[PDB]
């Protein structure tokens, strides 16, 4: 029920769902979550991939979203982040809502966390967890990957424009010294790297 308010008023949260601004806002909200991990001093690389299947991945080398079950809540902290709107201040719509809104408006979302020597994943359909967050391997790395398929029920157009993403990612690179920002478009075999060390 945590995501019901977003399913009911997608436009209020993400912006215009027709003109493509709301659609690209979905990527920017996930990137903003990775930028916060960089501002916290924990992340210095963010990779945005537009996939052949038209889904988008955002991967960071941050701490990784915490995976521990808060008995209070009964589920992994990550599931709380993905299925409950935060309480802080917040293309039209709201700026800084983060991944909960993106989850709600995605037909599918796949979460991978690299944390505490372990690889954890969870899948959502339209914001509903399909199974509890689970361990699937070991890793020496840390960070978070969010891959999402924006809902064809919510957005009249679902094809990401590599130029709109590239232009905003260059602004963010300039605004965030020391963060290596990579954009990959597998549809056209493009890679851009923006690295402003300052
Ligand atoms: C979408 O998640 C975002 C994160 O996005 C990314 N890409 O990392 C990032 O923006 C930021 O991530 C934080 C924000 C706060 C803490 C944080 O305070 C940590 N400190 C702890 O000792 C800790 C350890 C376990 C634990 O369950 C929690 C609370 C869990 C939270 C805040 C989800 C905190 C920690 O390890 O990781 C943190 C992380 C990874 O805030 C989220 C979780 C909403």
Residue numbers in the entry: 28 to 117, 126 to 233
What wording appears in the published article?
Bacterial DNA gyrase and DNA topoisomerase IV (topo IV), both type II topoisomerases, responsible for the ATP-driven introduction of negative supercoils into DNA and ATP-driven supercoil relaxation and decatenation, respectively, are validated antibacterial targets. Gyrase is a heterotetramer of GyrA and GyrB subunits (A2B2), while topo IV is a heterotetramer of ParC and ParE subunits (C2E2). We have developed compounds with a promising activity against Acinetobacter baumannii and Pseudomonas aeruginosa, which are both on the WHO priority list of antibiotic-resistant bacteria. Cocrystal structures of 1 in complex with Escherichia coli GyrB24 and (S)-27 in complex with A. baumannii GyrB23 and P. aeruginosa GyrB24 revealed their binding to the ATP-binding pocket of the GyrB subunit.
Whereas fluoroquinolones, which target both gyrase and topo IV, are widely used in the clinic, inhibitors interfering with ATP binding to GyrB/ParE subunits have not found significant clinical application, despite intensive research efforts during the last 70 years since the discovery of novobiocin, the first ATP-competitive GyrB inhibitor.
